Amino acid sequence: EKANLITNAKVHIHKLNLVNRNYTKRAEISRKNAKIALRRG
């Protein structure tokens, strides 16, 4: 199903984008902990 083949690719693009949301959040979370730990010394 070559249409579904081009469909499937366009599907995976959304998964790849979904994860990119998720790790963006964790990146900032880690940066918040760093800022705290500096103030912890």
Add this chain to the structure above:
Amino acid sequence: ELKYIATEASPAKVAEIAEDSDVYVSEIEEAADILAGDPEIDLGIDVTDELNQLE
């Protein structure tokens, strides 16, 4: 009975069902923003200056 509560308030299951909900929540909300994707076409196909005369 504490055993029977702890079987089904198991923190192994509380944390599972809480993580699952959050993924579906961000899946749906972003699937609402691509459901409002057309402003990018409206702002693009119409750029009409001429009505500054009409203004």
